[model samples]
Target: MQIFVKTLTGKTITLEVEPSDTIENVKAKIQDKEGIPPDQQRLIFAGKQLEDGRTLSDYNIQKESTLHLVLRLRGG
Candidate 1:
Protein backbone atom coordinates (compact mmCIF):
# COMPACT_ATOMS: atom_id res chain seq x y z
CA MET A 1 0.00 0.00 0.00
CA GLN A 2 1.01 3.64 -0.41
CA ILE A 3 0.89 6.57 1.98
CA PHE A 4 1.42 10.30 1.92
CA VAL A 5 3.95 11.98 4.19
CA LYS A 6 3.54 15.71 4.58
CA THR A 7 5.95 18.24 6.00
CA LEU A 8 5.08 21.26 8.09
CA THR A 9 5.92 23.44 5.09
CA GLY A 10 3.28 21.62 3.01
CA LYS A 11 5.59 19.44 0.98
CA THR A 12 4.18 16.01 0.38
CA ILE A 13 6.03 12.78 -0.29
CA THR A 14 4.24 9.74 -1.61
CA LEU A 15 5.78 6.44 -0.63
CA GLU A 16 5.03 2.78 -1.03
CA VAL A 17 4.80 0.82 2.18
CA GLU A 18 3.87 -2.65 3.26
CA PRO A 19 1.64 -3.61 6.13
CA SER A 20 4.58 -5.30 7.75
CA ASP A 21 6.90 -2.34 7.41
CA THR A 22 7.93 -0.85 10.72
CA ILE A 23 7.60 2.86 11.33
CA GLU A 24 11.36 3.17 11.60
CA ASN A 25 11.78 1.48 8.24
CA VAL A 26 9.44 4.01 6.72
CA LYS A 27 11.44 6.82 8.30
CA ALA A 28 14.62 5.39 6.78
CA LYS A 29 13.07 5.52 3.34
CA ILE A 30 12.15 9.13 3.92
CA GLN A 31 15.71 9.89 4.91
CA ASP A 32 16.95 8.34 1.69
CA LYS A 33 14.63 10.50 -0.36
CA GLU A 34 14.87 13.78 1.55
CA GLY A 35 18.16 13.54 3.43
CA ILE A 36 16.44 13.85 6.82
CA PRO A 37 17.56 11.45 9.51
CA PRO A 38 15.06 9.09 11.09
CA ASP A 39 16.07 10.40 14.49
CA GLN A 40 14.89 13.84 13.47
CA GLN A 41 11.61 12.66 11.96
CA ARG A 42 8.37 12.03 13.77
CA LEU A 43 5.39 10.55 11.93
CA ILE A 44 1.79 10.97 12.94
CA PHE A 45 -1.21 8.89 11.88
CA ALA A 46 -4.80 9.52 12.74
CA GLY A 47 -3.71 12.21 15.19
CA LYS A 48 -1.57 9.70 17.09
CA GLN A 49 2.17 9.47 17.25
CA LEU A 50 3.63 6.52 15.37
CA GLU A 51 6.42 4.68 17.09
CA ASP A 52 9.41 3.03 15.46
CA GLY A 53 8.67 -0.36 16.97
CA ARG A 54 5.29 -0.77 15.34
CA THR A 55 4.29 -1.60 11.81
CA LEU A 56 1.84 0.34 9.71
CA SER A 57 -0.69 -2.41 10.13
CA ASP A 58 -0.41 -2.11 13.87
CA TYR A 59 -1.88 1.33 13.64
CA ASN A 60 -4.53 0.23 11.17
CA ILE A 61 -3.23 2.68 8.60
CA GLN A 62 -5.02 2.16 5.35
CA LYS A 63 -3.82 2.82 1.85
CA GLU A 64 -3.66 6.46 0.77
CA SER A 65 -3.75 7.62 4.39
CA THR A 66 -1.86 10.85 4.85
CA LEU A 67 0.74 10.82 7.62
CA HIS A 68 2.23 14.01 8.93
CA LEU A 69 5.98 14.26 9.38
CA VAL A 70 7.17 16.79 11.91
CA LEU A 71 10.88 17.43 11.95
CA ARG A 72 12.75 17.81 15.20
CA LEU A 73 15.22 20.66 15.32
CA ARG A 74 18.61 20.02 16.81
CA GLY A 75 19.93 22.26 19.52
CA GLY A 76 23.47 23.56 19.63
Candidate 2:
Protein backbone atom coordinates (compact mmCIF):
# COMPACT_ATOMS: atom_id res chain seq x y z
CA MET A 1 0.00 0.00 0.00
CA GLN A 2 1.15 3.51 -0.79
CA ILE A 3 0.22 6.18 1.72
CA PHE A 4 0.66 9.93 1.52
CA VAL A 5 1.86 11.31 4.83
CA LYS A 6 1.44 14.89 5.93
CA THR A 7 4.05 16.02 8.41
CA LEU A 8 4.18 18.72 11.04
CA THR A 9 6.57 20.78 8.96
CA GLY A 10 3.90 20.99 6.31
CA LYS A 11 5.92 18.73 4.09
CA THR A 12 4.15 15.79 2.52
CA ILE A 13 5.93 12.52 1.90
CA THR A 14 4.87 9.29 0.29
CA LEU A 15 5.55 5.89 1.75
CA GLU A 16 5.45 2.70 -0.25
CA VAL A 17 4.60 -0.18 2.04
CA GLU A 18 3.77 -3.78 1.40
CA PRO A 19 0.51 -5.39 2.39
CA SER A 20 2.33 -7.32 5.07
CA ASP A 21 4.28 -4.38 6.48
CA THR A 22 3.44 -3.71 10.07
CA ILE A 23 2.65 -0.19 11.13
CA GLU A 24 5.90 -0.23 13.09
CA ASN A 25 7.82 -0.65 9.86
CA VAL A 26 5.99 2.24 8.36
CA LYS A 27 6.83 4.29 11.43
CA ALA A 28 10.47 3.44 10.99
CA LYS A 29 10.44 4.72 7.46
CA ILE A 30 8.67 7.87 8.49
CA GLN A 31 11.19 8.38 11.25
CA ASP A 32 14.00 7.95 8.78
CA LYS A 33 12.54 10.48 6.42
CA GLU A 34 10.81 12.90 8.77
CA GLY A 35 13.14 12.69 11.76
CA ILE A 36 10.24 11.73 13.99
CA PRO A 37 10.44 8.71 16.22
CA PRO A 38 7.75 6.03 16.46
CA ASP A 39 6.97 6.77 20.09
CA GLN A 40 6.26 10.38 19.18
CA GLN A 41 4.44 9.85 15.95
CA ARG A 42 0.70 9.99 15.70
CA LEU A 43 -0.76 8.73 12.48
CA ILE A 44 -4.41 8.92 11.64
CA PHE A 45 -5.87 7.42 8.53
CA ALA A 46 -9.40 6.66 7.44
CA GLY A 47 -10.76 8.30 10.54
CA LYS A 48 -8.85 6.01 12.89
CA GLN A 49 -5.49 5.65 14.55
CA LEU A 50 -3.11 3.23 12.86
CA GLU A 51 -1.83 0.96 15.55
CA ASP A 52 1.70 -0.41 15.48
CA GLY A 53 0.80 -4.06 15.22
CA ARG A 54 -1.56 -3.77 12.27
CA THR A 55 -0.53 -4.34 8.69
CA LEU A 56 -1.06 -1.85 5.94
CA SER A 57 -3.63 -3.79 3.93
CA ASP A 58 -5.42 -4.85 7.09
CA TYR A 59 -6.63 -1.31 7.47
CA ASN A 60 -7.84 -1.19 3.89
CA ILE A 61 -5.32 1.56 3.12
CA GLN A 62 -5.10 1.86 -0.61
CA LYS A 63 -2.67 3.66 -2.88
CA GLU A 64 -2.65 7.45 -3.15
CA SER A 65 -4.54 7.97 0.09
CA THR A 66 -3.32 10.55 2.60
CA LEU A 67 -2.65 9.84 6.26
CA HIS A 68 -2.27 12.74 8.63
CA LEU A 69 0.81 12.66 10.85
CA VAL A 70 2.03 14.73 13.75
CA LEU A 71 4.45 14.66 16.63
CA ARG A 72 3.02 13.37 19.89
CA LEU A 73 1.58 15.68 22.53
CA ARG A 74 5.10 16.84 23.35
CA GLY A 75 6.84 19.81 21.81
CA GLY A 76 8.73 18.92 18.71
Candidate 3:
Protein backbone atom coordinates (compact mmCIF):
# COMPACT_ATOMS: atom_id res chain seq x y z
CA MET A 1 0.00 0.00 0.00
CA GLN A 2 1.04 3.57 -0.59
CA ILE A 3 0.89 6.20 2.12
CA PHE A 4 1.38 9.95 2.01
CA VAL A 5 3.58 11.52 4.64
CA LYS A 6 3.74 15.25 5.32
CA THR A 7 6.59 16.95 7.05
CA LEU A 8 6.68 20.02 9.25
CA THR A 9 8.68 21.74 6.52
CA GLY A 10 5.67 21.59 4.25
CA LYS A 11 7.11 18.72 2.25
CA THR A 12 5.11 15.70 1.25
CA ILE A 13 6.45 12.22 0.59
CA THR A 14 4.67 9.17 -0.68
CA LEU A 15 5.95 5.79 0.43
CA GLU A 16 4.97 2.23 -0.23
CA VAL A 17 4.40 0.27 2.94
CA GLU A 18 3.23 -3.18 3.73
CA PRO A 19 0.30 -3.96 5.97
CA SER A 20 2.69 -5.36 8.55
CA ASP A 21 4.86 -2.26 8.62
CA THR A 22 4.99 -0.54 11.97
CA ILE A 23 4.78 3.18 12.65
CA GLU A 24 8.46 3.08 13.47
CA ASN A 25 9.17 1.64 10.07
CA VAL A 26 7.38 4.50 8.43
CA LYS A 27 9.30 6.88 10.62
CA ALA A 28 12.57 5.40 9.50
CA LYS A 29 11.56 5.70 5.90
CA ILE A 30 10.55 9.30 6.43
CA GLN A 31 13.89 9.97 8.06
CA ASP A 32 15.66 8.49 5.07
CA LYS A 33 13.61 10.50 2.62
CA GLU A 34 13.94 13.73 4.56
CA GLY A 35 17.43 13.12 5.87
CA ILE A 36 16.24 13.51 9.43
CA PRO A 37 17.03 11.52 12.51
CA PRO A 38 14.75 9.12 14.31
CA ASP A 39 15.19 10.99 17.58
CA GLN A 40 13.84 14.12 15.93
CA GLN A 41 10.95 12.41 14.24
CA ARG A 42 7.39 12.67 15.46
CA LEU A 43 4.64 11.01 13.50
CA ILE A 44 1.09 11.84 14.51
CA PHE A 45 -1.81 9.78 13.38
CA ALA A 46 -5.40 10.76 14.14
CA GLY A 47 -4.32 13.28 16.74
CA LYS A 48 -2.53 10.71 18.88
CA GLN A 49 0.99 9.60 19.61
CA LEU A 50 2.48 7.10 17.18
CA GLU A 51 4.90 4.86 18.99
CA ASP A 52 7.33 2.25 17.79
CA GLY A 53 6.13 -1.31 17.15
CA ARG A 54 2.62 -0.10 16.34
CA THR A 55 1.53 -1.37 12.97
CA LEU A 56 -0.63 0.41 10.43
CA SER A 57 -3.33 -2.10 11.24
CA ASP A 58 -3.21 -0.97 14.83
CA TYR A 59 -4.05 2.55 13.67
CA ASN A 60 -6.71 1.37 11.26
CA ILE A 61 -4.79 2.68 8.31
CA GLN A 62 -6.06 1.55 4.96
CA LYS A 63 -4.46 1.49 1.56
CA GLU A 64 -3.48 4.86 0.12
CA SER A 65 -3.78 6.44 3.55
CA THR A 66 -2.10 9.68 4.51
CA LEU A 67 0.07 9.88 7.62
CA HIS A 68 1.41 13.16 8.94
CA LEU A 69 4.94 13.25 10.24
CA VAL A 70 6.12 16.39 11.99
CA LEU A 71 9.64 17.24 12.97
CA ARG A 72 9.65 17.82 16.70
CA LEU A 73 11.63 20.82 17.84
CA ARG A 74 12.72 21.78 21.30
CA GLY A 75 12.96 25.39 22.37
CA GLY A 76 14.40 27.08 25.38
Candidate 4:
Protein backbone atom coordinates (compact mmCIF):
# COMPACT_ATOMS: atom_id res chain seq x y z
CA MET A 1 0.00 0.00 0.00
CA GLN A 2 1.04 3.65 -0.41
CA ILE A 3 1.34 6.29 2.31
CA PHE A 4 2.18 9.97 2.43
CA VAL A 5 4.91 11.35 4.65
CA LYS A 6 4.67 15.07 5.14
CA THR A 7 7.53 17.30 6.19
CA LEU A 8 7.53 20.44 8.29
CA THR A 9 8.17 22.50 5.18
CA GLY A 10 5.04 21.17 3.46
CA LYS A 11 6.89 18.71 1.27
CA THR A 12 5.50 15.24 0.85
CA ILE A 13 7.53 12.06 0.84
CA THR A 14 5.56 9.35 -0.86
CA LEU A 15 6.21 5.65 -0.21
CA GLU A 16 5.03 2.16 -1.03
CA VAL A 17 5.11 0.07 2.12
CA GLU A 18 3.84 -3.17 3.57
CA PRO A 19 1.97 -3.73 6.84
CA SER A 20 4.98 -5.57 8.20
CA ASP A 21 7.26 -2.63 7.53
CA THR A 22 8.67 -1.01 10.66
CA ILE A 23 8.86 2.69 11.40
CA GLU A 24 12.62 2.58 11.00
CA ASN A 25 12.15 0.99 7.60
CA VAL A 26 9.94 3.86 6.59
CA LYS A 27 12.54 6.30 7.86
CA ALA A 28 15.10 4.63 5.63
CA LYS A 29 12.84 5.24 2.69
CA ILE A 30 12.49 8.87 3.75
CA GLN A 31 16.27 9.10 4.02
CA ASP A 32 16.59 8.05 0.41
CA LYS A 33 13.93 10.49 -0.66
CA GLU A 34 14.73 13.50 1.56
CA GLY A 35 18.39 12.94 2.41
CA ILE A 36 17.42 12.98 6.10
CA PRO A 37 18.88 10.07 8.04
CA PRO A 38 16.75 7.69 10.07
CA ASP A 39 18.26 8.84 13.37
CA GLN A 40 17.18 12.36 12.60
CA GLN A 41 13.67 11.56 11.53
CA ARG A 42 10.77 11.51 13.95
CA LEU A 43 7.74 10.01 12.26
CA ILE A 44 4.28 10.70 13.59
CA PHE A 45 1.00 8.95 12.86
CA ALA A 46 -2.32 10.26 14.01
CA GLY A 47 -0.62 12.84 16.23
CA LYS A 48 1.40 10.21 18.08
CA GLN A 49 5.10 9.65 17.73
CA LEU A 50 5.87 6.34 16.09
CA GLU A 51 8.38 3.98 17.60
CA ASP A 52 11.19 2.70 15.41
CA GLY A 53 10.70 -0.93 16.38
CA ARG A 54 6.97 -0.88 15.75
CA THR A 55 5.36 -2.01 12.52
CA LEU A 56 2.80 -0.06 10.54
CA SER A 57 0.40 -2.92 11.17
CA ASP A 58 0.86 -2.40 14.89
CA TYR A 59 -0.21 1.18 14.49
CA ASN A 60 -3.15 0.27 12.28
CA ILE A 61 -1.83 2.32 9.38
CA GLN A 62 -3.82 2.10 6.17
CA LYS A 63 -3.46 2.92 2.52
CA GLU A 64 -3.05 6.59 1.66
CA SER A 65 -2.73 7.45 5.33
CA THR A 66 -0.69 10.52 6.13
CA LEU A 67 2.35 10.65 8.41
CA HIS A 68 4.23 13.69 9.64
CA LEU A 69 7.99 13.85 9.79
CA VAL A 70 9.57 16.08 12.39
CA LEU A 71 13.32 16.51 12.02
CA ARG A 72 15.64 16.12 14.99
CA LEU A 73 19.07 16.92 13.68
CA ARG A 74 22.17 15.88 15.58
CA GLY A 75 25.60 17.38 15.87
CA GLY A 76 28.21 15.71 13.67
Global lDDT of each candidate: 0.89, 0.85, 0.83, 0.92
Query: TM-score of model 3 relative to the true fold?
Result: 0.85
Tens digits of lDDT, candidate 3, 1-76: 8888887678778998998899889888888888888778888877887888889999888787777877777886
> Each candidate: how many clashes?
0, 0, 0, 0
TM-score list, all predictions: 0.89, 0.86, 0.85, 0.91
Tens digits of lDDT, candidate 2, 1-76: 6778998888899998887888888889899898888999988897799999998888888788788886777655
Which prediction has more favorable TM-score, 2 or 4? 4
Write the number of the candidate with greater TM-score, choosing between 1 and 4.
4
Off by over 4 Å in 1: 74-76
Candidate 4: count of backbone clashes, pairs at least 3 residues apart or interchain: 0
Which 10-residue window of candidate 3 scores lowest in summed lDDT? 64-73
lDDT of 1 by residue, 1-76 (tens): 8898987668898899998999999999888777889999999998999999999999998899999988877897
Stretches of model 4 off by over 4 angstroms after superposition: 74-76
Model 1, residue 10: what's the lDDT? 85
Native-referenced Cα lDDT, model 3: 0.83
Distance from true location, Cα of 29 in model 4, Å: 0.3
